Amino acid sequence: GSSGSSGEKPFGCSCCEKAFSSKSYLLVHQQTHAEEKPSGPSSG
Ligand SMILES: [Zn+2]
């Protein structure tokens, strides 16, 4: 249906469905995926 993207975001993450405006931002965001990864023994 009628659905658009807020602001020009030609940059879209690969792991998630997030989008940014400037690569720089997207990059820093990727760092998160390099930590607290979901793949774990399941220990609080
Ligand atoms: Zn991401």
mmCIF file of N, CA, C and O and ligand atoms in Angstrom:
data_model
loop_
_atom_site.group_PDB
_atom_site.id
_atom_site.type_symbol
_atom_site.label_atom_id
_atom_site.label_comp_id
_atom_site.label_asym_id
_atom_site.label_seq_id
_atom_site.Cartn_x
_atom_site.Cartn_y
_atom_site.Cartn_z
ATOM 1 N N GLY A 1 0.807 -1.206 0.000
ATOM 2 C CA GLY A 1 0.000 0.000 0.000
ATOM 3 C C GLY A 1 0.843 1.260 0.000
ATOM 4 O O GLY A 1 2.064 1.199 -0.138
ATOM 5 N N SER A 2 0.188 2.407 0.155
ATOM 6 C CA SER A 2 0.884 3.688 0.167
ATOM 7 C C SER A 2 1.904 3.742 1.300
ATOM 8 O O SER A 2 1.557 4.013 2.450
ATOM 9 N N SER A 3 3.164 3.481 0.967
ATOM 10 C CA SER A 3 4.235 3.496 1.957
ATOM 11 C C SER A 3 5.542 3.979 1.336
ATOM 12 O O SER A 3 6.016 3.422 0.347
ATOM 13 N N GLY A 4 6.120 5.021 1.926
ATOM 14 C CA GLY A 4 7.366 5.564 1.418
ATOM 15 C C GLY A 4 8.454 5.605 2.473
ATOM 16 O O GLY A 4 8.237 5.195 3.613
ATOM 17 N N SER A 5 9.627 6.101 2.094
ATOM 18 C CA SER A 5 10.754 6.189 3.014
ATOM 19 C C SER A 5 10.971 7.628 3.471
ATOM 20 O O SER A 5 11.001 8.553 2.658
ATOM 21 N N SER A 6 11.123 7.811 4.780
ATOM 22 C CA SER A 6 11.334 9.138 5.346
ATOM 23 C C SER A 6 12.744 9.639 5.049
ATOM 24 O O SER A 6 13.719 9.160 5.625
ATOM 25 N N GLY A 7 12.843 10.607 4.142
ATOM 26 C CA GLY A 7 14.137 11.156 3.783
ATOM 27 C C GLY A 7 14.919 10.243 2.859
ATOM 28 O O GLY A 7 14.729 9.027 2.872
ATOM 29 N N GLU A 8 15.800 10.830 2.055
ATOM 30 C CA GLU A 8 16.611 10.059 1.119
ATOM 31 C C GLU A 8 17.622 9.192 1.863
ATOM 32 O O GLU A 8 18.587 9.698 2.438
ATOM 33 N N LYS A 9 17.396 7.884 1.848
ATOM 34 C CA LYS A 9 18.287 6.945 2.518
ATOM 35 C C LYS A 9 18.754 5.856 1.558
ATOM 36 O O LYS A 9 18.303 4.712 1.610
ATOM 37 N N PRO A 10 19.681 6.218 0.657
ATOM 38 C CA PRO A 10 20.230 5.286 -0.332
ATOM 39 C C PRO A 10 21.121 4.225 0.305
ATOM 40 O O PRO A 10 21.684 3.376 -0.387
ATOM 41 N N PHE A 11 21.245 4.277 1.627
ATOM 42 C CA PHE A 11 22.069 3.321 2.356
ATOM 43 C C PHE A 11 21.208 2.436 3.253
ATOM 44 O O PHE A 11 20.508 2.924 4.139
ATOM 45 N N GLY A 12 21.266 1.129 3.016
ATOM 46 C CA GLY A 12 20.488 0.195 3.809
ATOM 47 C C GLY A 12 21.329 -0.935 4.365
ATOM 48 O O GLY A 12 22.001 -1.647 3.617
ATOM 49 N N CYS A 13 21.297 -1.102 5.684
ATOM 50 C CA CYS A 13 22.064 -2.152 6.342
ATOM 51 C C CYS A 13 21.834 -3.500 5.664
ATOM 52 O O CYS A 13 20.903 -3.659 4.876
ATOM 53 N N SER A 14 22.690 -4.467 5.978
ATOM 54 C CA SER A 14 22.583 -5.800 5.397
ATOM 55 C C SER A 14 22.022 -6.792 6.412
ATOM 56 O O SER A 14 21.217 -7.658 6.068
ATOM 57 N N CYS A 15 22.451 -6.656 7.661
ATOM 58 C CA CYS A 15 21.992 -7.540 8.727
ATOM 59 C C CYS A 15 20.551 -7.222 9.114
ATOM 60 O O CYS A 15 19.738 -8.125 9.317
ATOM 61 N N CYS A 16 20.242 -5.934 9.217
ATOM 62 C CA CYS A 16 18.899 -5.497 9.582
ATOM 63 C C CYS A 16 18.224 -4.782 8.415
ATOM 64 O O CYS A 16 18.771 -4.717 7.314
ATOM 65 N N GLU A 17 17.033 -4.248 8.665
ATOM 66 C CA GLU A 17 16.283 -3.538 7.635
ATOM 67 C C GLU A 17 16.314 -2.032 7.879
ATOM 68 O O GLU A 17 15.387 -1.312 7.507
ATOM 69 N N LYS A 18 17.386 -1.563 8.508
ATOM 70 C CA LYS A 18 17.540 -0.143 8.803
ATOM 71 C C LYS A 18 18.175 0.592 7.626
ATOM 72 O O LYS A 18 18.877 -0.009 6.814
ATOM 73 N N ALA A 19 17.926 1.894 7.544
ATOM 74 C CA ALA A 19 18.476 2.711 6.469
ATOM 75 C C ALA A 19 19.020 4.031 7.005
ATOM 76 O O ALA A 19 18.480 4.595 7.957
ATOM 77 N N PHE A 20 20.092 4.519 6.389
ATOM 78 C CA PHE A 20 20.709 5.772 6.807
ATOM 79 C C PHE A 20 20.892 6.710 5.618
ATOM 80 O O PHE A 20 20.630 6.338 4.474
ATOM 81 N N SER A 21 21.341 7.930 5.897
ATOM 82 C CA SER A 21 21.555 8.924 4.852
ATOM 83 C C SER A 21 23.022 8.969 4.438
ATOM 84 O O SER A 21 23.342 9.000 3.249
ATOM 85 N N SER A 22 23.910 8.973 5.426
ATOM 86 C CA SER A 22 25.345 9.019 5.165
ATOM 87 C C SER A 22 26.020 7.728 5.616
ATOM 88 O O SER A 22 25.863 7.298 6.759
ATOM 89 N N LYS A 23 26.773 7.114 4.711
ATOM 90 C CA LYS A 23 27.474 5.871 5.013
ATOM 91 C C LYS A 23 28.052 5.902 6.425
ATOM 92 O O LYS A 23 27.782 5.016 7.235
ATOM 93 N N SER A 24 28.845 6.929 6.712
ATOM 94 C CA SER A 24 29.462 7.074 8.025
ATOM 95 C C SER A 24 28.533 6.562 9.122
ATOM 96 O O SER A 24 28.891 5.665 9.886
ATOM 97 N N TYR A 25 27.338 7.138 9.193
ATOM 98 C CA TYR A 25 26.357 6.744 10.196
ATOM 99 C C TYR A 25 26.110 5.238 10.152
ATOM 100 O O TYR A 25 26.211 4.551 11.170
ATOM 101 N N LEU A 26 25.785 4.733 8.968
ATOM 102 C CA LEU A 26 25.523 3.309 8.790
ATOM 103 C C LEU A 26 26.678 2.471 9.329
ATOM 104 O O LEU A 26 26.466 1.454 9.989
ATOM 105 N N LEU A 27 27.900 2.905 9.043
ATOM 106 C CA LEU A 27 29.091 2.197 9.501
ATOM 107 C C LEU A 27 29.074 2.027 11.017
ATOM 108 O O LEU A 27 29.077 0.906 11.526
ATOM 109 N N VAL A 28 29.053 3.147 11.732
ATOM 110 C CA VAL A 28 29.031 3.123 13.190
ATOM 111 C C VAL A 28 27.934 2.200 13.708
ATOM 112 O O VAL A 28 28.092 1.547 14.740
ATOM 113 N N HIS A 29 26.820 2.149 12.984
ATOM 114 C CA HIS A 29 25.695 1.305 13.371
ATOM 115 C C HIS A 29 26.056 -0.172 13.246
ATOM 116 O O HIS A 29 25.631 -0.994 14.057
ATOM 117 N N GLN A 30 26.842 -0.499 12.225
ATOM 118 C CA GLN A 30 27.259 -1.878 11.994
ATOM 119 C C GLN A 30 28.073 -2.405 13.171
ATOM 120 O O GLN A 30 28.031 -3.595 13.482
ATOM 121 N N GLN A 31 28.813 -1.511 13.820
ATOM 122 C CA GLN A 31 29.637 -1.888 14.961
ATOM 123 C C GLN A 31 28.820 -2.655 15.995
ATOM 124 O O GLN A 31 29.317 -3.584 16.632
ATOM 125 N N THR A 32 27.560 -2.260 16.157
ATOM 126 C CA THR A 32 26.673 -2.909 17.113
ATOM 127 C C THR A 32 26.538 -4.399 16.817
ATOM 128 O O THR A 32 26.501 -5.223 17.730
ATOM 129 N N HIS A 33 26.468 -4.737 15.534
ATOM 130 C CA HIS A 33 26.339 -6.130 15.116
ATOM 131 C C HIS A 33 27.597 -6.920 15.465
ATOM 132 O O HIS A 33 27.590 -8.150 15.461
ATOM 133 N N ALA A 34 28.675 -6.203 15.768
ATOM 134 C CA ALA A 34 29.939 -6.838 16.119
ATOM 135 C C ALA A 34 30.075 -6.989 17.632
ATOM 136 O O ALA A 34 31.167 -7.229 18.144
ATOM 137 N N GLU A 35 28.958 -6.845 18.338
ATOM 138 C CA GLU A 35 28.954 -6.963 19.792
ATOM 139 C C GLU A 35 27.604 -7.464 20.293
ATOM 140 O O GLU A 35 26.589 -7.330 19.611
ATOM 141 N N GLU A 36 27.601 -8.043 21.490
ATOM 142 C CA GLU A 36 26.376 -8.567 22.082
ATOM 143 C C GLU A 36 25.640 -9.472 21.100
ATOM 144 O O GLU A 36 24.422 -9.628 21.174
ATOM 145 N N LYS A 37 26.390 -10.068 20.178
ATOM 146 C CA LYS A 37 25.812 -10.959 19.180
ATOM 147 C C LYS A 37 24.755 -11.864 19.805
ATOM 148 O O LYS A 37 24.852 -12.260 20.967
ATOM 149 N N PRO A 38 23.723 -12.202 19.018
ATOM 150 C CA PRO A 38 22.630 -13.067 19.473
ATOM 151 C C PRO A 38 23.077 -14.510 19.673
ATOM 152 O O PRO A 38 22.607 -15.197 20.580
ATOM 153 N N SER A 39 23.990 -14.966 18.819
ATOM 154 C CA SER A 39 24.499 -16.330 18.901
ATOM 155 C C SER A 39 25.288 -16.540 20.189
ATOM 156 O O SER A 39 26.487 -16.269 20.247
ATOM 157 N N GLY A 40 24.606 -17.025 21.222
ATOM 158 C CA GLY A 40 25.259 -17.264 22.496
ATOM 159 C C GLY A 40 24.694 -18.469 23.221
ATOM 160 O O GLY A 40 23.691 -19.053 22.810
ATOM 161 N N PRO A 41 25.346 -18.861 24.326
ATOM 162 C CA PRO A 41 24.921 -20.008 25.131
ATOM 163 C C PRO A 41 23.618 -19.743 25.877
ATOM 164 O O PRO A 41 23.070 -20.634 26.526
ATOM 165 N N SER A 42 23.126 -18.512 25.779
ATOM 166 C CA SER A 42 21.887 -18.128 26.447
ATOM 167 C C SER A 42 22.110 -17.959 27.947
ATOM 168 O O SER A 42 21.395 -18.543 28.761
ATOM 169 N N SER A 43 23.107 -17.156 28.304
ATOM 170 C CA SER A 43 23.427 -16.912 29.706
ATOM 171 C C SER A 43 23.232 -15.441 30.060
ATOM 172 O O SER A 43 23.871 -14.563 29.483
ATOM 173 N N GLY A 44 22.343 -15.181 31.014
ATOM 174 C CA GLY A 44 22.079 -13.816 31.429
ATOM 175 C C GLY A 44 23.329 -13.100 31.900
ATOM 176 O O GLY A 44 23.945 -13.547 32.867
HETATM 177 ZN ZN ZN B 1 22.171 -3.195 11.059
#
